Curated annotation (Swiss-Prot):
Transmembrane segments: none annotated. Belongs to the bacterial solute-binding protein 1 family. Part of the ABC transporter complex MalEFGK involved in maltose/maltodextrin import. Binds maltose and higher maltodextrins such as maltotriose. This is Maltose/maltodextrin-binding periplasmic protein. It comes from Escherichia coli (strain K12). The complex is composed of two ATP-binding proteins (MalK), two transmembrane proteins (MalG and MalF) and a solute-binding protein (MalE). Induction: Induced by maltose and the transcriptional regulator MalT. Permanently repressed by cold shock in a PNPase-dependent fashion. SUPFAM superfamilies: Periplasmic binding protein-like II. GO terms for biological process: carbohydrate transport; cell chemotaxis; detection of maltose stimulus; DNA damage response; maltodextrin transmembrane transport; maltose transport.
Length: 518
């Protein structure tokens, strides 16, 4: 339950240079007498938010930057406040990757992008296009080899192809994300994923291939190509395969667009060792010697530290990494990234296995990715118009008909629940004694308990939201209207976290509208 004072516990993924990181920890111990323990738990990016929410977990968590906005939003990360001298030692765009609501919430370490890795003794020149891979596989099959194996279990590896002809996560224009505008089930995404599925149908790839299977095949000289990041180069070096690292193939004449990650280190908000952690990260790890120790274990990519990157940049494999990165897109760090990845992971796995068609898989992924924002739209608008008596005139935006009709439905059914359950609602409002924002943020734990116990149905979702409206009316009448949007956010988080899979199975809010159709 409590993080131990006077030591450092660090989590890093098991594909990274954790032995090199431990060597940095031993240098830290030699100076300070403070022991550093490096661990690489399975699913650490899922475990961290669970354990840290209880005040437990590591002092320092390493992951790509995309998960950190979610952690920061949940209050799990300490704000990072390096001095100018330190900040100037790292590239500005790396600090940008770890900025969330105006605050730095991790230290950037290195820039990662996937590349095409190829065996020059099988394939002296890499394919420039995805479309030529089937014919190459046919040539290679006659030699008792295959063209390509890569991890089909993690959507990170398949995204570059999905993105190539126009798939996107959240639209980015005019220096801004439009979180309502999700690009998972458009014609471009379908074209990419169909190409992948056709590779599998035509026995060029196997839907069961995972990281270890692809890595072993490439490193044993059994397959001519793989798709992987810099961390994989150590094991390829050890294997003695004559390998190149190059630009990903094009699809429909367009570059493959990898999602670019910045390996980052956050400090747990519950750590009593924040000063020790800052010292470790700034004055041991983010040094030429610290990064070299990690990079010698498993390569980092293009490091954030300018002095060391100037050495590393002369490596053609790093040049290739950066070429692919420039053709791709820096991942968002918005809290909705976790859901996007979960939705797309399932879509790829189901399309690849034949459990769903591409169209079915991508429709579900779209709905899953849109769920938080659409739910918040509906719930916020209902609570606010209930509180004030006046509706919001702003356009609903994307999937607007569904939002509008869900709101219209919820007006009917939710107004009814408020009337019929006035007595329970008034009683409970009095018991909970909500006076301010602090009281609203305290509701989540109890709300999750109540709502997640028992059966799942649309009626209970209506009760959740309708009591929210009942509370919002109270908040407005005591001059606490500023608490309504935090309330709506809390209710939305409870709903979507606890009922994600059920919601997607209903066609989200279209299910709700149909369920209560008069
Ligand atoms: C039965 C019921 C449900 C449900 O079926 O899941 N929900 C209610 C919401 C409110 C009420 Cl009054 C009732 C319910 C209810 C009760 N009896 N009857 C006859 C009714 C209709 C009281 S026993 C259940 C209960 C409620 C709380 N506790 C400690 N136990 C307050 S902690 C909280 C909970 C919220 C909240 C939802 C929005 C905002 C704040 C919330 C703060 O939503 C919980 C999920 C929705
Ligand atoms: O597959 C979804 C997954 O993609 C990214 O994770 C990468 C990670 O960034 C790399 O450093 C390397 O470890 O491979 C992972 C893919 O298995 C996202 O960072 C992650 O949040 C997301 O779930």
């Amino acid at each position: 339950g409590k993080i131990e004072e006077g030591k450092l516990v660090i989590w890093i993924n098991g594909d990274k240079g954790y032995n090199g990181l431990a060597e940095v920890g031993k240098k830290f111990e030699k100076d300070t007498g403070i022991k550093v323990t490096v661990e690489h738990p399975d699913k650490l990016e899922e475990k961290f938010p669970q354990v840290a929410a209880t005040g437990d977990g590591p002092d320092i968590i390493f992951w790509a930057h995309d998960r950190f906005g979610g952690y920061a939003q949940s209050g799990l990360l300490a704000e990072i406040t390096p001095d100018k001298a330190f900040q100037d030692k790292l590239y500005p765009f790396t600090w940008d990757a770890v900025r969330y609501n105006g605050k730095l919430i991790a230290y950037p370490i290195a820039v990662e992008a996937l590349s095409l890795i190829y065996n020059k003794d099988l394939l002296p020149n890499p394919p420039k296009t995805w479309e030529e891979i089937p014919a190459l596989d046919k040539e290679l099959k006659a030699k008792g080899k295959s063209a390509l194996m890569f991890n089909l279990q993690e959507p990170y590896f398949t995204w570059p192809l999905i993105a190539a002809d126009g798939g996107y996560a959240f639209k980015y224009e005019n220096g801004k994300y439009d979180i309502k505008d999700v690009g998972v089930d458009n014609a471009g995404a379908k074209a990419g994923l169909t190409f992948l599925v056709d590779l599998i149908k035509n026995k060029h790839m196997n839907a069961d291939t995972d990281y270890s299977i692809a890595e072993a095949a490439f490193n044993k000289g059994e397959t001519a190509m793989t798709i992987n990041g810099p961390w994989a180069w150590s094991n390829i070096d050890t294997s003695k395969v004559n390998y190149g690292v190059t630009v990903l193939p094009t699809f429909k004449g367009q570059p493959s667009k990898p999602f670019v990650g910045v390996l980052s280190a956050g400090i747990n908000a519950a750590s009593p060792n924040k000063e020790l952690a800052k010292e470790f990260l700034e004055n041991y790890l983010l040094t030429d010697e610290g990064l070299e120790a990690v990079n010698k274990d498993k390569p980092l990519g293009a490091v954030a530290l300018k002095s060391y990157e100037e050495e590393l940049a002369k490596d053609p494999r790093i040049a290739a990494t950066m070429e692919n990165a420039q053709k791709g897109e820096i991942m968002p760090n918005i809290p909705q990234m976790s859901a996007f990845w979960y939705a797309v992971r399932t879509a790829v796995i189901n399309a690849a296995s034949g459990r769903q068609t591409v169209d079915e898989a991508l429709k579900d992924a779209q709905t899953g990715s849109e769920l938080y924002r659409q739910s918040l739209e509906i719930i916020s608008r209902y609570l606010r118009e209930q509180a004030t008596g006046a509706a919001d005139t702003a356009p609903m935006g994307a999937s607007g008909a569904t939002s509008r009709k869900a709101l219209e439905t919820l007006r009917r059914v939710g107004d009814g629940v408020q009337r019929n359950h006035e007595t329970a609602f008034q009683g409970m409002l009095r018991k909970l004694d909500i006076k301010n924002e602090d009281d609203v943020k305290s509701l989540s734990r109890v709300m999750i308990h109540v709502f997640s116990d028992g059966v799942t149905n649309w009626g209970r979702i209506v009760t959740l939201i309708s009591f929210g409206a009942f509370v919002a009316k109270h908040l407005k009448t005591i001059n606490q209207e500023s608490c309504i949007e935090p309330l709506a956010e809390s209710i939305t988080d409870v709903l979507v976290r606890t009922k994600r899979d059920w919601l997607v199975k209903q066609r989200g809010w279209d299910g709700f509208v149909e369920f209560f159709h008069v």
